[PDB]
Each structure stands twice: as structure tokens, then as C-alpha cells.
Amino acid sequence: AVPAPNQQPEVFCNQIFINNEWHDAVSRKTFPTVNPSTGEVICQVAEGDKEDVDKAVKAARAAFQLGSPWRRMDASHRGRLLNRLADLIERDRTYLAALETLDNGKPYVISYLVDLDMVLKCLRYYAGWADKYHGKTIPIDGDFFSYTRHEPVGVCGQIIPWNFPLLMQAWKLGPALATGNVVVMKVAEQTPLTALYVANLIKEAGFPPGVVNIVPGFGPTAGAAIASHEDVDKVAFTGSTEIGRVIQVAAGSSNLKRVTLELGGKSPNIIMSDADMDWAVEQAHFALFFNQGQCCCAGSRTFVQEDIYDEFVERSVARAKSRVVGNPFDSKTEQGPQVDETQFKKILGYINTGKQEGAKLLCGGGIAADRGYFIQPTVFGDVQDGMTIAKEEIFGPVMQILKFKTIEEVVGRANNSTYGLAAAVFTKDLDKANYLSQALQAGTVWVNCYDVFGAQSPFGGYKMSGSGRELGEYGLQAYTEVKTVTVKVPQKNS
Amino acid sequence: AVPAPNQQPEVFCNQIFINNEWHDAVSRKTFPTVNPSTGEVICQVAEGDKEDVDKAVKAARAAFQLGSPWRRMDASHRGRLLNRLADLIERDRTYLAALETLDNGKPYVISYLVDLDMVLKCLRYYAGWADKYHGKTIPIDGDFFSYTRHEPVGVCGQIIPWNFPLLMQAWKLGPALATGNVVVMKVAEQTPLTALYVANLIKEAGFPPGVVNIVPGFGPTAGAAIASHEDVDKVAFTGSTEIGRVIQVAAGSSNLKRVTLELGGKSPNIIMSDADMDWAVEQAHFALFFNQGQCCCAGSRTFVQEDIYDEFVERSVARAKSRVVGNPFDSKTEQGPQVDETQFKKILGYINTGKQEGAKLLCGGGIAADRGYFIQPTVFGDVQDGMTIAKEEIFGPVMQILKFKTIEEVVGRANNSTYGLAAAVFTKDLDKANYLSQALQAGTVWVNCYDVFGAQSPFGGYKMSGSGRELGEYGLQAYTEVKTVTVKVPQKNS
Amino acid sequence: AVPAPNQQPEVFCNQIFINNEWHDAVSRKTFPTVNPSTGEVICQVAEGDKEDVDKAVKAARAAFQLGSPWRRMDASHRGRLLNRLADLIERDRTYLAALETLDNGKPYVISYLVDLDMVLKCLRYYAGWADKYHGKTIPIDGDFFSYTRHEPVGVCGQIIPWNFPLLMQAWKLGPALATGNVVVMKVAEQTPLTALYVANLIKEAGFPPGVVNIVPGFGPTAGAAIASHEDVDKVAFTGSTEIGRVIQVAAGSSNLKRVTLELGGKSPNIIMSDADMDWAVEQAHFALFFNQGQCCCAGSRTFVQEDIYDEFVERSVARAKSRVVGNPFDSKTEQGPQVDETQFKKILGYINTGKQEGAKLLCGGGIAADRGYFIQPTVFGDVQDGMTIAKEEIFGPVMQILKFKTIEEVVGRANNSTYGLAAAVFTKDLDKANYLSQALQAGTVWVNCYDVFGAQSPFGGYKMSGSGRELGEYGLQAYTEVKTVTVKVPQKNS
Amino acid sequence: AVPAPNQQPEVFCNQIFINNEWHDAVSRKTFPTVNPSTGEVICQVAEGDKEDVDKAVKAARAAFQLGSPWRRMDASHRGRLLNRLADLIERDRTYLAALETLDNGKPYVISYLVDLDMVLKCLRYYAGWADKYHGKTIPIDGDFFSYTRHEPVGVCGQIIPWNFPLLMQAWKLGPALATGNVVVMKVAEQTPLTALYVANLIKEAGFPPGVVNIVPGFGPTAGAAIASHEDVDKVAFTGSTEIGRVIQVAAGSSNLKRVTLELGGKSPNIIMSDADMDWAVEQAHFALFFNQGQCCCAGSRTFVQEDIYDEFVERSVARAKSRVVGNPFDSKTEQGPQVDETQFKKILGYINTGKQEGAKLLCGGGIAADRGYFIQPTVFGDVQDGMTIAKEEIFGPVMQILKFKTIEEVVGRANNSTYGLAAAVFTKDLDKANYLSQALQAGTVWVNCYDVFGAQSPFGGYKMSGSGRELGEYGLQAYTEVKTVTVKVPQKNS
Numbered sequence A, B, C, D: 001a002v003p004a005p006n007q008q009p010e011v012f013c014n015q016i017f018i019n020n021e022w023h024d025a026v027s028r029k030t031f032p033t034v035n036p037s038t039g040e041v042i043c044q045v046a047e048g049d050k051e052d053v054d055k056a057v058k059a060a061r062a063a064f065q066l067g068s069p070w071r072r073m074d075a076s077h078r079g080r081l082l083n084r085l086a087d088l089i090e091r092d093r094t095y096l097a098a099l100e101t102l103d104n105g106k107p108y109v110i111s112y113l114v115d116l117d118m119v120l121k122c123l124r125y126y127a128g129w130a131d132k133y134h135g136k137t138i139p140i141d142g143d144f145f146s147y148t149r150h151e152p153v154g155v156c157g158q159i160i161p162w163n164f165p166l167l168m169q170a171w172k173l174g175p176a177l178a179t180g181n182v183v184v185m186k187v188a189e190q191t192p193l194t195a196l197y198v199a200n201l202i203k204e205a206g207f208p209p210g211v212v213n214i215v216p217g218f219g220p221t222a223g224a225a226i227a228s229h230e231d232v233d234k235v236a237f238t239g240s241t242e243i244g245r246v247i248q249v250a251a252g253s254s255n256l257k258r259v260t261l262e263l264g265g266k267s268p269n270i271i272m273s274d275a276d277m278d279w280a281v282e283q284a285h286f287a288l289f290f291n292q293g294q295c296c297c298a299g300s301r302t303f304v305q306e307d308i309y310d311e312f313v314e315r316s317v318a319r320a321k322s323r324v325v326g327n328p329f330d331s332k333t334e335q336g337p338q339v340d341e342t343q344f345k346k347i348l349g350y351i352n353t354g355k356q357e358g359a360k361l362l363c364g365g366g367i368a369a370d371r372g373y374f375i376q377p378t379v380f381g382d383v384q385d386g387m388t389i390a391k392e393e394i395f396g397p398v399m400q401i402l403k404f405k406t407i408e409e410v411v412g413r414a415n416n417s418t419y420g421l422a423a424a425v426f427t428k429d430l431d432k433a434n435y436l437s438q439a440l441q442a443g444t445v446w447v448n449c450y451d452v453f454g455a456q457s458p459f460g461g462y463k464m465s466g467s468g469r470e471l472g473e474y475g476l477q478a479y480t481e482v483k484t485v486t487v488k489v490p491q492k493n494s
């Protein structure tokens, strides 16, 4: 039961957020943000650059000074504040769900039922962690009392993508704020609106000035400024593997700030012959087409056992063909437009490469509307490992279906990738589930399911899909600076 | 009561260690390792470079293959092997203590009682972690069974310094091997002998070929080869902040391998007026002069309250003057020579800089012997924050003594550094100890003691002194790759 | 600045709570609950017995059945429910604060600011734990995948006292509900009203029927019925050491249900000569006189160093004499009446005993008003260890001041008790604080403070003061049953 | 590879172990220990009673005094000693393996390869936990520094059974000693020899006097003295559910000492139709017949799905018939004699009762030899839930085979028991394994395996099979007393 959306939600925030105040970029320059469904401009947004980031870092640093409201605040109260933020977000759930769709292109029903639900669940999860991330008392040798203090890492720079604007923001603010840090966030230029509105709610929730600062702008400008800043203690990046490299290099070249990376992938979805056919087909479809295929953990390599290959392919094609593409605000819509023109063109480029390489085009393969960035649900069959569409992240509605024979074989092929963000196994056999779930070199391996995210279960990648983990208790590790205090005592006893 | 050392221990290992075999460099080239006490060459060592590193990485990769002896081995048995290694090291304790001194210069009494004790204690500590670093079963939403697998990160490249050859090796091998990883270790060209011998013991301990591979050689050559290798999953470096940046840069430019850094520092030792004078004076002396002042956490900025300044300085100068400098094999010797000519010259350069800037030279200040790299225990009084000797890591027997008035003042001054490896507070007052230990931005804050390391308590830096932590349970984080496995279940129940 | 209290709150709940419904005792019997300030009956309450408890256990058991709403409910949602319960309690804070005073006698200012604040904090704290008490994935030998499920203990019987009605209820419900258990609670016959109203809010909060059942009644009847019940999986009791013995015996004689006990004590408050006099005096007074001295961890043994003894005693008597005793609803009141006539008489008996034994009565020692159960703040000086008032829990406004000389002496004397719930050390010296906090055999040692409770810090007794802990992460251990699942896999790897 | 056993090992220890010395009972009385294979007396053993226990408790209490060798010892050193004890046991493996069989009756091959291997693994495992059971630093509200100290519980009474003499000793000594506690152990009168010899090794290993005291004797005498002792802080019992209740009552009646219990069971071994027949048959045989059927977690209720019932029974009967019964020192021997005459007769009694109730006797059913306590491997078919042999712990070579149809059916039938120690599920289906492993109310659920014990995985019972857990990290909870130290600080900061 979803409330009726406002298909033209008003924009109240489009500037730079620093010290709980709205500012225009120092240069006074702005950039337009487009509605991917119409190709039309929504509004103008403050284009932050290095000088703006510098202002934000100074505000954050200030808020992190020993004896400041944020440093002196009870850990339990940070939990109250995070829960309050979640309440304000839920209060404006219908509005944000619409604004998310307006700016991003994803179906409103999904923004409402999936996106914001996961935002609330994440913040509320982390509100619980606020006063429970214990340090330790250590049984060190000699007459000493040793213990550790789990302190905040300090000023954290958080750079996020455009595929899940609100959720990606939540995945960052939740753990950072729960551990007492201060942030300077760089939202994606393609989808800055929703995160900016949340900042208004952060001020309403009562978070002290400078605790959270949002700088909307471009990557090589605002982004690089954060990653290279001499006073940024930590940087958390989510985006392309390519920019992940740029981020780590910048950290090493600057002040050696701690780094975590949530990059891309080419996750294999393995379908064994003893799989529940209906279930595997519907799930494999979701595994790839979810969020216009714009998901890092997209099951873009569907390996199907040869015995059930034909039937699986047949049903998959049928399901893809029936997938309703259209205006994201229409409840009938299963797939909206791609985020922007650049992405739209890149996907079309890959589709063309798929055909050129000899991949069997089974359906779709072209534009789905003469307005907006709509692409037809595309399916390629008989894909080979060496093919470009089987190695590179397409980030669109393009499905690769490969055929395999043995379990040993599929393990090697699934693992022969520089990525390793996710993986999936569909089987009814206990031994096969365990054999594969252990053999697969991926951050997350789903069995008889896909895209199952839990604020309590960590998510991150193996190899070049990233480093470090988000969500769960693990998501706190990167936002903590450990201090050992070893005190001399008159006489130590057990 | 140390056993009689063999002042001229024979060298049995001087090559490259790969697959439990000794190999000459592909180029057949060798480099000499010198005895800092005599300036004479001890022997020739195989000079490993990129091609040799590639041989080691291939060996380690092979040893990490699913189904291999190392991957199939019980975690508990890894602990057995680590305890075995420890036994072999304890059997050859006097030999290794002597060889350590021969190649490093540090007093034999210290190599035996301190260095090798801490090696044994670190290895035995981690042997216990081998089968206790549990993953988790998570209470995720929906009908799913979610749990994490704490897998080894993979091929770990480990680059270490020369100040504590054996100890630094242990600090790395302990956690890496305890978690089931394989390594390619690059020992310091100045002190490669002992670590190579330990490799012999690893083979005798029963570790499978390729699990631990050691490549002796230079930094820009062997070291950079490791940090830039496309098949090294993680890299752990300990050394200068300068090279730390090169390491992180190389990681980002290559395969995005995980990185932890244990860099240098300019640690402040704070002496409050209510401190036990005698203890503070002796501890302060040890805090700086320990290991010829060649310790990362050396208390190179001794802040003393104005009320007890004069007396503390007087007593400090007296203690430095009586510090016996001589042949490291002489039981009377408290301080041996600096590791090499480069360090020798660099320290002398800093001493000259101290004088040039107006720092009051109180004692020492020059060469202590016409043979070997001996430098006199030097003390500078009335040091100011802006002076070079008050800002840069001298890494030699040079003590800086500064005067302060208030506790708020010393906090700001102590924290006014791009370093933050350690710190110390000497006071009898409960409130002062707590206030200071909290306020100080250091990775380890010692209260009424200094240089108290515990295999159970984490060690690492804040700011540019590094990232990550070694020792304790934390030492295991960087050597684990988390895998979330979420399985679909008929119906989840609490 | 507390809201004006309704000095005669209306009672809405006075029956037995089962399956979210109100029932009269099967016997139809009722018992009166008295207002200790007036001695007048407030109202009648349903007198539950064995048969009523049998109904409650059946309801609880039913709600705990696999597949039931409560068992299927997401752990995160349990958190939501607990946070909701907390909001309702806060909504009705002014009413509940008043009712707590009317039924218990403690000052309204304290019920509002202290009691209810701690209720909220406890509940919100535990709401956070709901989805974070992870099980483990274990690195067992051989080809097996071993892990542990942290399941609910099941049906938990919870018996609580009357000194902190609301608080004692929260400390029991928070951890139990957060872990997914169902409870059958037996509230103290002296103060049953507030807990009954909270049951109403539990229904309003949305907790499934039978998850929380509350049976008001007497101990030998209702309490024993729960303790000896063949279908209660676990019992958590808080009360006198006497009854704790009865509870553990009952559990052993019945179904071997798991038991944890929070009994009484005779906690020592040690005042060293270098302690801040003003602070020590005010704190020691609070340590004993808090909640009319009706606190399990009251510092009933104030040890003061001989050099500052006379001064401390003099100030203490002055503080006790100025303590305003009166109508708990009058904002001027610091001390209300004892809970009931039984306690009133028991305290009077202890006061007479103290005089009889030769303890120097310094002030008070008699009845404070001719109506209600008010007793004058009493102070006994020169108390000796063998004295009864120095060994037994008085649970009334009767302070015992003992004199000591050395620190070794006081340690032995403080530990010479069968109790060991809490202890306190007042000193400015770092070494004294560490020496004593380690030496003292007490569940909680406060340094330079008293009665500092934190929903995140455990609380429990050493020796006969109890077993198991409450609050903190520790409070969840007793509400969890661990299940090890060891699965056979094709080939185990790290 | 099994070394040749000494069929008549000499006995060196047969007295009471207190303060590292051997004592005769105060009464000078002794009791005989019989060789179950011959019925002949091996030797006389000191008969400890209350007065002896009192001596042992006084010795243990002394060794636990603050400032004592054991209390001051480094946690890591405790680990050294535990590993030392393990080495000494391995040195005397062959001897202890023989003496274990001589006194217990189990096959020597099993005593060597299984029993002593598990002892060694348990000890070495816990040696590792010595310095890793961290306390916590807690984020409490207000200006305070709160942390917890994980202290030893104190004097621990440990009463164990006779089925696994050495192993049961290890399971108790490992966790207790690793946590710094002192023990008073009451070994089974039936098998006291081996435990007394290990006491010798304890002294040789270097454990301080009074740390481990061993009192051989009877239950109602020595055992009850321990459980009822006013100075025993905690009791850990492993035996019959019946005595478990006596133990808990004793603790409640005395000083409210902490209690954990490892009682018996009537564990279900569920074989679904899709199970690997050969494997299920061989494992089910092992599940019951292991250690002459004298195992607490014995799969005494073998449920088999109707479709594979006949085949399963046929094969099981054939396997039971071929099971070689004989002299435990003969390599061919799979099954030795029962521990003693009492068990021998009790088991025969149950066999009679089984026939009486209409259970289909398929094989065995009587005495296997006219000397010693040998019983034929017995199998009963068509067992019904209501039968005595399907409800009571037989603790002998008597197999119960029940037939079932559905999975929902088998869950309720398996759970319909007051016991809940273990359970097993044999199936190839992933969903069935997870459904059953979650549904079964057992402390341990083995999937496609049985009797898989891991020092790292917890073991304990649900319901009346016990409370608390042994092995793994959990095994340390019962041996730790949590102390919370809450210190006032000038100003708390994150």
C-alpha cells in the first residue's frame, strides 16, 4: 500500500551545506541536474570546488575539537540523534521517495518500498551501535593496566555515486555518526537533491553545526579536493574501480588518510541443474535488471548448467520481454530510464560491442523511447568469458547468459575476474551450496537468493571491487582510531 | 645472567628464500651487509629484484590455492606450527641474539633479553589466535540465514626496517600466518641475516613450501616490486613516513591491494611536576636512548613542567653522560653503534642543525669512537617547538628537552605534530593521567612508564605515523577478508 | 524544572496481565496496596497464584512457538518495538513518575528525573542490541562448517523487588525482549501499580499477545509458582539473599531452569585521606541515603582514614541532620517514607541493635513523623566490623562510619563480607585507585563517585550478592541459549 | 600409528592431591577400582570425604590470594604452563592411553587416537585463550571512564563422570586454568587413576601448589561436600540429570555458588530418505555404539523415513552383528566392556524392558562374555515414542530405530523430550538441513555427521541436558567474574 506520489516535487535545497547553513559556491557557479525521464533540467545546484571543500573541512575540524558539543556528547545521545533523523526521514518518506525518482529515474514504488525502507533500517541499525562499540581491557605482561579507547577517526570525507543517492548516503552517515566522527560529503553531480534535503533534516534532528557538511559538485573538482586535503583523516569512496585508484593515490600523495573503497563488479550468478527453475529465473532476472541494471553487485554473468540451459534461457527471454519500461511514477513501471545521457550512451555502446563480438542477441538491444534515457531490457545468450560484455561492467539492463558443465569448471570461470564484489548460487544440494559458497572469491555470496542486503550483514569486495566493508559491525572498523593506554600499576593481579 | 655470546657467529643463510629453498638472485648479483661496530663487511647477500619477487609471488600464490596443504590445514594446526617455530627460535636463542647484534649493532644483552623474548612472546601469542578469530552468524531481516567467513586476505607483501630485524619479522609473520595467509617478505638491506636464518627454521618447523618467502634486497627494487605487484592482495609496511607514501601510491596505481602502515614519529614524553623524579628521569632517558635512539616511538620531545625543569635537566644530563657506549658484545655496554654510515651522518647532521638553531647543547654532540658508527649520548635543553630537532625524527641518541607551564598548553604543543605514534604522561594524579591520556592524539599513551609493548596490546599511529594497528586482536583485522554468505531458508525463526 | 505532579493519580490497571488482556485472579481474590506516605490503601490488586501463573506460562509458551509472530519477527523490529515502548513511557512520564511515588514513597523529583530517565535509557539501550548479538562461524578441524545460533532462552520468569519498581522491570524486559524471549513477570506486592500500567503500554506498543505477561501477587505463592514451574526455561530474580537461595533450590528441584540472581549487599565506601573532603562527604551521604537507603548497592560501610575521620564524621552528621524528610510530592523533600510497615519496623530494629552493640549514635535514630513510615536520617559512628549493623543489610537511612589506618587493612576489612555487590574508593592518587579497584571483591567499584549506573556497564554481585550480570552486553548472555551447528562439507579451506 | 600398549601399566598415583603433594584420606580409608574387562581389582585408592575436601578448598583458596604466584602470574604464562602440561601428557600418551583402557574398558586404539588426541587438542586450544579474553572499555553517559575487568571466578569445584576420564578432566581444567581460577576436582570413583596421574604432570609442568587439587572418592560424600562448601565459588558438574538437580539444590542451599551442568540426553539421529545410505548407516552406528554406548550425546533415537526404513534397518543390524566385542587391548576390538557391574546390570535391565514393551529385538540382547562386563551390540526395531527405551538414557550398546513419515512429524517427535543435548540430520537437501538444524531444540545439531567435537565449538544442553556451555570461547564465560570499574573524569570526550 503505497501513498500517491507528487510527480513534480518542489526543491527546497540546492546549495552547499556547511555548519548547518546553506551557502552558494565561493565562485557562485552552479550546475544543472536533469530528470532522466524527460531529459529536462530540474533545477540549478551549487557547484562546489576546492575552496568550498576547504571551508567544509574547517567547519568539520572545528566541530571535532576536544570539548566541543559533539565530542562531549554521550554516545547514547548520538544514538538518539540518529534515530531522530530516521524519524524525520520517515515523516518525509513520500516526498523523498518522489524526489529520488525525479532526480534518479528509478520507479517510485521501489524508491518508497525499497530505497527509503533500507535508509531507515540502516540509520536505525547504526543508532544502536552508538554506545556499544567497546574498546578492550588487556591482560598485558608485567605490572601494567592496559586498555584501548575506540576513538573517532576524525574528519571523514565521503564520496558517493548516483545509483542509490539516499541509501549510499545512509551507508556512510550511519557508521560515521554512530562512532562520533564529523563528515564532509561529496554527493554525485547527477543526483544531488535528495542528500541535500536530508542535510536539512540533519539540522532539524539537532546535530551540532559542522558535524555533517555536504558539498555538491563534480568529481575531479570537489571530490579530488577532499581526497587530497591535508586535514581529512579518512576517506570512504563508492564508485568506479577506476576512480577508486585515483582516490587511493591521492591519499598516499597527501596526508596518508585512511582509505576504504566500495567499487564495481561483474558478479556471477551460478544456476545448478537441481535449482528451482521458476525461482532461479525470476531471481536471475532481478539479479541483473534491478535498478535499471545500475547496481554494483549486479549478477551480470549468469552461468547456467547445460542440462537446463535452453529452458532457463527461454524463460529468461520471456521475462525480459514482459518487463514494463516507462514513466517511473506510473505504478505499472518495473524499469525507469538510465541516470543520464553519458550512461545511456555507454550502455548502447556495450550492446553494440556484444553484437560485434558474436554474442547471441535474444531480445531488446535498442532504445525504448524517443524521450528520456530508456533502454530495452536486453539479453545476450551463448556469451563467452573472453567477450567484453562478459568482463566489463555495463551498469545497464543487459544480461549475459553463459553455459557451463561441471562445478569445478564454473568455480574457475566465476573466479577468473579482477572483480569480486558479489556472487550467487542456486541449488537444492547442501554440499554444492557449501562447496561453492566457500570457493567463490566474492564479498557476498547469496544462495537461492540475490540482492539481499541487511544493515547487519557486511558488504564490500574482494580484489578490485574494493577494500574494507560496509554495514554490520564491520562498518565501524574504518571509522575508529584505536588508542592503547598502558598504565604502570603497583602490582598486577588476575 | 645471559649465556656467553659467540662474538663471531657463522652465517648459514644469505640467499633468497622461495618454496623452502635457497636461491641466488636471477641476476646472480649480491650486496654486502656491514657490521656497524667495525665498519667491516660480514658477508655477501643475494640481491633480489623484481624478477625474484615475481618468483616469490608465484610460489606464494600457488601455496594459497584452494585444496592446497596450507588452505586445507586445520586452523589449530597453524597454531601448532607457529608454536613449533617459536621453539626452534628459542633453541637457537643465543645464536640469533648474537647474529642480531653483529648485523644490527644493538647490545647483545638486549638482543637476548629484550629482542628475542619479544619475538617468542609475539609468535606464541598469535599461535593462540589461529583458531579463534570467529566470523559471525547475523540476525538479518527476512527468511535468510546470514553469516560471515573470515578468510585469509591472500598473498601478503611485508616490508620491514632494520632497527628490530627479528622483532619486526615476528610482528608480521605472527598474525599473517595465524590467519592462514601466505607472505613475500622484504627484509631491510642493512639487516637481512637473522630474518633469513628464521626462514630456515620455518622450513624445519614444517610450514608448507611457498607459505613464507623472503626476498632480501633494496627498497626501490625488491620493495617497490612487491608494492606494485598485480598479484599481491595486501601489503604491510613499516618504515619512514616518506616511503609510506610511496607504498600507498604504488598500491593505488596497481591492483588496489589492502594497505597498513607503521611509520615514524616524534613522540612527546610529558613530565608533570608531581611525577616521581627519579623514575621520570630514568624512564625519560630510556624513552629516548633505547636501541641507540632508533625506535619509532622514541620519546624525542621531553616536555617538563617549569617547576621541576632544572632538576630534571641536571639529572638527565648526568644519566646521559654516564651511559656506557661501546662494543655491543661487552656486557657493560648500554649503547652500541648506529646501524650504518647513512644513519650515522644523518644524526650528526641533526646535531649540527640543533646547534645552528640555538638549542642548548648540554652533553655529547659528536663521534664516540674512531671506528664503527658510535655517537655520544647527546642532550639539548631549552628546545622550542619550531626547531628542526623538535619536529623531525632524528632516529639517534639525541634528546630534546622542552619546558612548559600548564596542562592545557602541553596538550596543544604535544598534539601540534603531523606525527602521532605514541606519547607518555608521568604524574601521580588520577585526574591528570586520565585528562592527558584522553587528549593526546597518539596511538599509544603510556602512563608512568615508556616503551611497554605487549603482544596483546595494539600498536600503531595516528595521523602520519601510519594507519592500522599491529599486535593484539586488532593485528588480525588487516589479514582477514570478510565474506558474507546469505542463504535463503524456508522460514526464519529467532 | 519538573512538571507539576498529580498528587493523586488515577489507577487504570490493577489486574493480571496475560495475552495482552486483563484478568481477575482465578480465585477472584485481591490484596490492598498501601501509600507509605499516608499508610492509607490506594486500591486493590488482583492476587495471582499458582493457577494464574500456569495460565501465563501457557500463554508465553504459545507465543514462543516456532512460526509464531514473535519468533518470525525480524530482530530489528524487536528493536523498533522496544524504542516504541520507550516513547510511550516518556509520553506518560509525568503520570508514571507520580504513580511510582504514590505506591513507593520515593520523592517525585527523583521518580521523574532519576527513575524514569533510567527506565527510558535502559529500554532504548537494549532496543539497539536486538539485531547485534551475533553468533559465530567457527574454524573447527576437519571438513566441517561449524557455527553457533544465539537463540532465545525461551520462557523467562522474572521476579522483582519494590525499591525501583519501574527500573527493575526495565532491567528485566530490555535484555529479554531484545533477545526474543517471552516473559512471565512477578512484581513486588508492595509496588505493583506502575508495572501493570507499563503492561498496558506494552500492548499499545504492538508487542504480540503472550510475549509479556505480568502476574501481581505474593512471593511464596506467585513467585514460587514461577520458580518451580516445569515449563519456565529461565528465572531472573532480584531481591533478598534469603529468597535467592529459595529460588535456586526451586529451579534445581524442578526443571533445571537457568538462574541468575541480583541479591543484596553491605557495600564499603572507602575514603582515603587525600580525598576531596567536600565531594567525599556529599557523595558518601548520597551513597547511603539514596532512595531512603533502599538500594542494593548502598554504601552501608563508610571506611574513613583516621587522619580525616573526625572532620568527615562532623560534616556527615551535619549533612544528615539537614536532610529534609517529608511528603515525597513536596519539591523540598529529599527523603520520603520507607516502602511499608514491615521495613519500617525492621529498620527500627536495626537502629536499636546498633545502640545495643555500642555503636555511637550521632544523630536521628527514631521515627520522623506520626503518620506514614518516615524514619530520621541516622548516623552511627565508631562502628566495628563484628557489629550486626556492620554486617547486615539494613535497607534504611542508617549510616555506618568505620575508622581505618592503612590501605592493606581496609582492603581486608572491606572484603570481609559474604556480600560483594559494589564498593567505592575516594582518592586523588592514581596508584591507590588502581590498587583498590583491583583488590576489592565487588561487582562494581566506583572511583570518586557512587551509584553511577550506565545501561551499557554491567551490574551484579560477587559472592552472595548474586550471580550473573545485568545491563551492558553482559545482560544478554543469560537470555541466550547457544546452539552449535556442525555441518559436513566436501572440503574445508581457510 | 598406534604404538604397542603395556597391557598392565603400573599405577604411580592413588592418593589425594593437595598443594602438589599426595595425601591419604584423613580417615585413611580407601576404595577399590576395578578393571571392567576382568572384574578384577586394579588397586586401592584414597577415599576422600568432607574433611579432605575442606583441606583442598583451603589449599585452593590460599593459592588464589591476591599477590600469590598464581594471581600475579602473566596470563600468557598460564598459557605457557597449559602448553607445557599438554607436552607432558603427549610424552606419556602411550602410558595414559593404556591406563585409561585398564580403568575404563574402552579400546586402547580409541584411548590413544581419539581420547588422548582430544585431551591434547583441548588443552592446547585453551592455552591460547589465556591472554585473549578481553574485558571492555564502555561508552557510559556523563563524565566517567567505565571499563570491565574479567577476573577469575575463584575456587572452582569440578565434578566429572567416568566415560571419558581424561577428556572430561581436560574440558574442566582447560577453561578454568586459562582464566586463572583454582580448582578442587572430584573424579569418578569408577575411573580415578588417569586423572590422578595427570595431577603428577600438573606439578611437573610448574603449576603453583593449590592451583589444582584432586579429591578421589564417592559422590554423596566428596561430591556433595564440594557442592555444599561455603567457600567454593563455582561448581561445574557433568553427569546424570538426577545428580544435576542435587548439585543445583546444594548450591542454592549453601553459598549461592555459580553453577553450570552437563547432563545426559536421548539424542535423535534423523535419517531422511535422500540421505547417503552407506554413510548414514555407518554414522548412525557410530552415533550410538561409540564408547560402548556410554556417551551423553549418543544418538539413542534413530529416526528413519519409512521409504528407506527396511534397508536402513537391515544394514544396521548387519553392522551391529559384525561389531567385534572383546579385550580392549586387542586391536581387533571395536567394543570393550561396560565401566562396571552397576551399569552392566542396568543396561541388561533396559534390554529386558525393551522386549517387555514390544520393541522388536533384531540382534544381540544379552551378555557377550562370561567374564568382564561385556554386552552384545543390541538393536531394537519398530520403537515407539512412549516406550521406556525410547525415553530413558540407557548408556549402553542398545540401538532404538523408529520410523517416521513427514519432516514436520519428526521435528515434533524429536523435540518431544525433556532432554536436548544433541541431535543429527542426514540429508542431501539444503532446505531440509537448514529447516531441521533450526527446528531441533538441541545444544548441538550435526548435519551429515555425528560426534564431531571441536575444542573451538561449544557443547551443552537444552532443557534438562544441562545449562551453560563447554568448549569454545563460551566455555570461559562460567569461569569469569565481571567487575565494572566506573571512574569520574574531568571531562569525557569521544
Ligand SMILES: NC(=O)c1ccc[n+]([C@@H]2O[C@H](COP(=O)([O-])OP(=O)(O)OC[C@H]3O[C@@H](n4cnc5c(N)ncnc54)[C@H](O)[C@@H]3O)[C@@H](O)[C@H]2O)c1
Binding pocket: B159, B160, B161, B162, B163, B186, B187, B188, B189, B217, B218, B219, B220, B222, B223, B224, B225, B227, B238, B239, B240, B241, B243, B244, B246, B247, B262, B263, B264, B265, B295, B296, B343, B346, B393, B394, B395
Ligand atoms: N617507524 C620506524 O620504525 C622507522 C623504521 C625505519 C626508518 N625510520 C626512519 O627512516 C629513516 C631511514 O630509512 P630506513 O631505511 O630505516 O626506512 P625506509 O622507509 O627507507 O625503508 C623501510 C623498508 O622499506 C624498504 N624500501 C625502501 N624504499 C622503498 C621503496 N621505494 N618502495 C618500497 N619499499 C622500500 C626498505 O628496504 C626497508 O625494507 C630513518 O632515519 C628514520 O627517520 C623509521
Ligand SMILES: [Mg+2]
Binding pocket: A033, A034, A035, A036, A102, A103, A104, A189, A190, A191, A192
Ligand atoms: Mg539528476
Ligand SMILES: [Mg+2]
Binding pocket: B033, B034, B035, B036, B103, B104, B189, B190, B191, B339
Ligand atoms: Mg648491517
Ligand SMILES: [Mg+2]
Binding pocket: C033, C034, C035, C036, C102, C103, C104, C190, C191, C339
Ligand atoms: Mg505500597
Ligand SMILES: [Mg+2]
Binding pocket: D033, D034, D035, D036, D102, D103, D104, D190, D191, D339
Ligand atoms: Mg575401574
Ligand SMILES: [Mn+2]
Binding pocket: A219
Ligand atoms: Mn564519474
Ligand SMILES: [Mn+2]
Binding pocket: B219
Ligand atoms: Mn630508506
Ligand SMILES: [Mn+2]
Binding pocket: C219
Ligand atoms: Mn520478602
Ligand SMILES: [Mn+2]
Binding pocket: D219
Ligand atoms: Mn552415580
